[PDB]
Amino acid sequence: NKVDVLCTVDGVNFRSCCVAEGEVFGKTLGSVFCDGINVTKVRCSAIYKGKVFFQYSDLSEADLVAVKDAFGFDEPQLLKYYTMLGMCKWPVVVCGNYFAFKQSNNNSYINVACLMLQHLSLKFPKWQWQEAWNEFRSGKPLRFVSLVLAKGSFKFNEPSDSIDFMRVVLREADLSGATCNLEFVCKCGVKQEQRKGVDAVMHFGTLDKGDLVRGYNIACTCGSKLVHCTQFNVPFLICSNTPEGRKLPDDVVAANIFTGGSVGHYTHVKCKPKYQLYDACNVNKVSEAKGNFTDCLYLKN
Amino acid sequence: MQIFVKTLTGKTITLEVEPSDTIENVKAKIQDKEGIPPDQQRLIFAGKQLEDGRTLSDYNIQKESTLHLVLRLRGG
Ligand SMILES: [Zn+2]
């Protein structure tokens, strides 16, 4: 008469829990997700035998620590995560070696951020992020997207910045070994700095890796200051800038394009073969890479 | 102490701050001078994005340093 299921808050530790058949799950379990669905108001049936129910109401102190360890979330973020998980049901389309999202709820910034991240080899210290990333790489990205949306300040159905999505992801990745050596030269003097982690693999102010290698000038109280990377030791590099209709720098693997003014629309181009242009779930071969580029990805090897 | 913020229009802003100020603090001050909501502001120091919760001292931002202000894009 009772169905045996597994209860968890973190997907790491589980306890057996029983629910009477025909009874609404929330009555005994509180708010619950099962296989990515909010089943709080679903009536218990034998089809759910042995399945895993993620709880997120009435979290104890010990539960909150487990959630922080596995998700990196506090309670409001966790609730935002499950809200996002319930709402973000965007169809995913496979385009050769990559996947893309149908246009929906102003998700172009997510689409092109995910198209760029599909080039990267990343590992995540937090269990839920690593597991969602494995599903992401298998072509099931919605759980990973929901983590990112909850971790950041993103609002569902609102147009946003693809660089913020990528940065939220990269701050969760293990980038312990990534560094770059910078030198700065102006009339103020000469200083060195070694950037690490996300600060080593993301650079804002130019799209062209060659600008970093050669040096390029930024504003300074003395007039201008040369910024020069004397050594790269990163697996990849994302150079970002205010959208500009410049020529695509050499050696770029993929780039994000932002079209419009205050509110706009993202597209994405890959350069192997030159070129594949993505717009939502459409992909077309084109002979030139043009548009107002805003993020450029470089890869080692 | 004074720091300077270069904007996309070309204008250079002068802020009065202490090394203990947070980036969130700096963004609030920018809103006061220019009216730009902090949630739209991206602050950069020599190519490095500056995170809200950290302080100027954490980033080695000293007197008369120049930051760059850009707006977050809104792509749907
Ligand atoms: Zn100088």
From Swiss-Prot, chain A:
Residues 1-55 form the Ubiquitin-like domain. Zn(2+) 3 binds at C186, C188, C220, C222. It is a multi-pass membrane protein. A zinc finger (C4-type) spans 186-222. It is found in: Host membrane. Residues 70-301 form the Peptidase C16 domain. It catalyses: Thiol-dependent hydrolysis of ester, thioester, amide, peptide and isopeptide bonds formed by the C-terminal Gly of ubiquitin (a 76-residue protein attached to proteins as an intracellular targeting signal). The active site is at S108 (for pl2-pro activity), H265 (for pl2-pro activity), D279 (for pl2-pro activity). Responsible for the cleavages located at the N-terminus of the replicase polyprotein. In addition, PL-PRO possesses a deubiquitinating/deISGylating activity and processes both 'Lys-48'- and 'Lys-63'-linked polyubiquitin chains from cellular substrates. Participates together with nsp4 in the assembly of virally-induced cytoplasmic double-membrane vesicles necessary for viral replication. Antagonizes innate immune induction of type I interferon by blocking the phosphorylation, dimerization and subsequent nuclear translocation of host IRF3. Also prevents host NF-kappa-B signaling. This is Papain-like proteinase nsp3. It comes from Murine coronavirus (strain A59). The chain holds residues 1609 to 1909 of 7176 of the full protein.
UniProtKB/Swiss-Prot annotation, chain B:
The modification (Microbial infection) ADP-ribosylthreonine is found at T66. The modification ADP-ribosylglycine is found at G76. Changing S65A: Prevents phosphorylation in case of mitophagy. Decreased localization of PRKN to mitochondria. The record marks R54, R72 as: Interacts with activating enzyme. Changing S65D: Phosphomimetic mutant that binds and activates PRKN. Changing R74K: No effect on ADP-ribosylation. There is a cross-link at K6, K11, K27, K29, K33, K48, K63 (Glycyl lysine isopeptide (Lys-Gly) (interchain with G-Cter in ubiquitin)). The modification Phosphoserine is found at S65. It is a peripheral membrane protein. Changing R72K: No effect on ADP-ribosylation. Phosphorylated at Ser-65 by PINK1 during mitophagy. Phosphorylated ubiquitin specifically binds and activates parkin (PRKN), triggering mitophagy. Phosphorylation does not affect E1-mediated E2 charging of ubiquitin but affects discharging of E2 enzymes to form polyubiquitin chains. It also affects deubiquitination by deubiquitinase enzymes such as USP30. Residues 1-76 form the Ubiquitin-like domain. The record marks H68 as: Essential for function. There is a cross-link at G76 (Glycyl lysine isopeptide (Gly-Lys) (interchain with K-? in acceptor proteins)). It is found in: Cytoplasm; Nucleus; Mitochondrion outer membrane. Exists either covalently attached to another protein, or free (unanchored). When covalently bound, it is conjugated to target proteins via an isopeptide bond either as a monomer (monoubiquitin), a polymer linked via different Lys residues of the ubiquitin (polyubiquitin chains) or a linear polymer linked via the initiator Met of the ubiquitin (linear polyubiquitin chains). This is Ubiquitin. The gene is UBB. The chain holds residues 1 to 76 of 229 of the full protein.
